[PDB]
Design a protein around this ligand. Structure first.
Ligand SMILES: Cc1ncc(COP(=O)(O)O)c(CN[C@@H]2CONC2=O)c1O
Ligand SMILES: Cc1ncc(COP(=O)(O)O)c(CN[C@@H]2CONC2=O)c1O
Ligand SMILES: [Cl-]
Lengths: 382, 383
């Protein structure tokens, strides 16, 4: 029934509301709900169905496998994936009508052959490296790749449906690289559009860019994190101020509550020692479940009406908390992260406690943790 | 057929070799292979099967669900799980002949009711908190818990098959807490025995205690990490020094290789800027796959014959490495973590880079990452 140890509660109603709120932010563009990495830990399919429901025109994933799983789940509509390696399932992707990203000639050649075998045309989108220095084609190789693409288009083997890029510091309001990439993108797009490419969509914005720079919207925006009700960065504001609602609530039940004398060590390395006779509670969730070990001694948890802090080192499967004078009992609910509007710890709180970013917190929630859905439509729960 | 992006290759022969090596260390005790957390990221069923056939007489998991997955996979023999919460599948565990741990009064009473409903006697193991401050019964409550158990015993509802504990700093050779806990264990164990408990097994030793303090072996030793070929700590030496063979090898295929101008920013935040014109390579694995973001700028990877450091911020699905003048092409192999003997970066190397411990490195390798099994017996990698 309802997991007795720990479980991740996913609110499909918060998801749908976030996508409606995000659509309103970029009224002139289409919305792509990025659901890679199991929808940032919330559950790929359920969240993809909910997103499409609230009005998402596109669905995006990193790997082909992720995109094929969406199709296999009966999801219709445009889907795009961009992280490819030589020898990937191009043919499978083409046959399921999935837009593929091309960054180098090696990719283009593999998609052209796969198209032949499939006896079908592949919808490809050209990625320009405007400054991030990650994936994508560099300005120096752009003219060549562009020429090869319009050539393959003529051979009826491919069809260039898009031209896109990705930001490096869009989450740093005001960073000089942002404008630099926006200009580099405008310039490389024009050169492509002048060489014979008529794109279906033009896109470069992610969640932070979408929430702050309307000049980056173009035809489509790729929103991942914001969809799950988490703010890209604190400099952009809290989900509340952003009009977003947190989709995930992580809950656990106490496994033990006992009294210990003063001077008693707690956990590995005994990095925590009780100050006086106190009450300790055992939370049965550890770093194997996604609770960062680097949050040792700082991780916030809500127990018995008050916020508690991880006591000492966080272990593989569990960690303790010092309830002090307060009392509680085994089976009592413990909220590790959820909604700030309900006075609970948040994804951002843990990011700060573990010296990382909110993106990693929600995304790394372990497979050992069951997910429970509420809201949305019944079929979303599959 | 074989993962084109990233994958974990698990060497089942290394597993068999380690448990065999571990048994030679504690000749007069039974060995419990701890395969919780999906065998520390190596694959629970294949590893449980392998260790069993190599000589492990007991199997240990943290949760009931993990222990029941083993039974469901046809694994026979003694199995124990210790992380229970109210409402757990007591009835189901008891019926599948799994040894459960009881550290409080709430548990004891739930298992009694469960045993009655199953029409069978439950095998329970009493845990004593000798200094960890985690689970287990505090010394001052031992008397009462031991009292309620020997009673439930007389009613034929339960049978106390074991008494045990867990060390806080056995991985720190010569720590005063070690002896402190060992002493406490003997003392609490003795009391239990005197009041009526006849344990089938007495245990307190984990991997580090097993490799260092033979006086902690007792009847059973619970080894987890060492079974997979990784050392509990640099302080104890390297796997090679401990005579252990690493079982996991994380490999990836470059997704791109390109030349970039001098002074070009790399990844989020631009925390890395090329010092000159150079070749950049994209490794298609990121923190969603288990590569810690905390190793940004430090995590080692073996590419084109040399060890390279993560250039800048590590992302959710990938990260970049600067190859300098060297050349490589999309599809070429990169070893993220493997065997130092093969000249590859290791679990410890990454533990250092991410300011954490090797335990968390191997364990958090994601589900998005496929596992390929080599060696062992064919039927082992069927699940
Ligand atoms: C190419 C691309 N587009 C869009 C997104 C969506 O971004 P948001 O989640 O910010 O809306 C991502 C995710 N980028 C991530 C997130 O964390 N690490 C990454 O590489 C991406 O890689
Ligand atoms: C109760 C218990 N027994 C045995 C083991 C196996 O120990 P080794 O892996 O050191 O051999 C562990 C380790 N559990 C882990 C591992 O890391 N943190 C923990 O709490 C444990 O918690
Ligand atoms: Cl109790």
């Amino acid at each position: 029934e309802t997991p007795t140890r720990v479980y991740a509660e996913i609110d499909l109603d918060a998801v749908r509301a976030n996508v409606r709120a995000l659509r309103a932010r970029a009224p002139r563009s289409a919305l792509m709900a990025v659901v890679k990495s199991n929808a940032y830990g919330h559950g790929a399919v359920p969240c993809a169905r909910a997103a499409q429901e609230a009005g998402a025109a596109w669905l995006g994933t990193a790997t082909p496998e992720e995109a094929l799983e969406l199709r296999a789940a009966g999801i219709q509509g445009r889907i795009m994936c961009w992280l490819w390696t030589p020898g990937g399932p191009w043919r499978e992707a083409i046959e399921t009508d999935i837009d593929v990203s091309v960054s180098g000639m090696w990719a283009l050649d593999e998609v052209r052959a796969a198209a032949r075998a499939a006896g079908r045309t592949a919808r490809i989108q050209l990625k320009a490296d405007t400054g991030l220095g990650r994936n994508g084609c560099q300005p120096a190789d752009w003219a060549e790749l562009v020429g090869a693409a319009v050539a393959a288009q003529a051979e009826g083997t491919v069809q260039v449906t898009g031209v896109w890029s990705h930001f490096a510091c869009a989450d740093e309001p005001g960073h000089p690289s942002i404008r630099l990439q926006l200009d580099a993108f405008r310039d490389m797009l024009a050169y492509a559009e002048k060489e014979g490419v008529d794109p279906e969509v033009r896109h470069i914005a992610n969640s932070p860019a979408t929430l702050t720079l309307p000049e980056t919207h173009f035809d489509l925006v790729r929103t991942g994190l914001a969809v799950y009700g988490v703010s890209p960065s604190p400099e952009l504001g809290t989900p509340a101020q952003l009009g977003l609602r947190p989709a995930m609530t992580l809950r656990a039940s106490l496994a033990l509550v006992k009294t210990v004398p003063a001077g008693h060590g707690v956990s590995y390395g005994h990095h925590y020692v009780t100050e006086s006779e106190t009450h300790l509670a055992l939370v049965p969730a550890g770093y194997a479940d996604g609770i960062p070990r680097n949050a040792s001694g700082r991780g916030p948890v809500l127990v018995a009406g008050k916020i508690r802090r991880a006591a000492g080192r966080i272990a593989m499967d569990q960690f303790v908390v010092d309830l002090g004078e307060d009392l509680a009992e085994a089976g009592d609910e413990a909220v590790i992260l959820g909604d700030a509007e309900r006075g609970e710890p948040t994804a951002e709180d843990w990011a700060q406690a573990a010296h990382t970013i909110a993106y990693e917190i929600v995304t790394r929630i372990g497979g050992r943790v069951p997910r429970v859905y509420l809201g949305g439509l019944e079929h979303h729960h599959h």
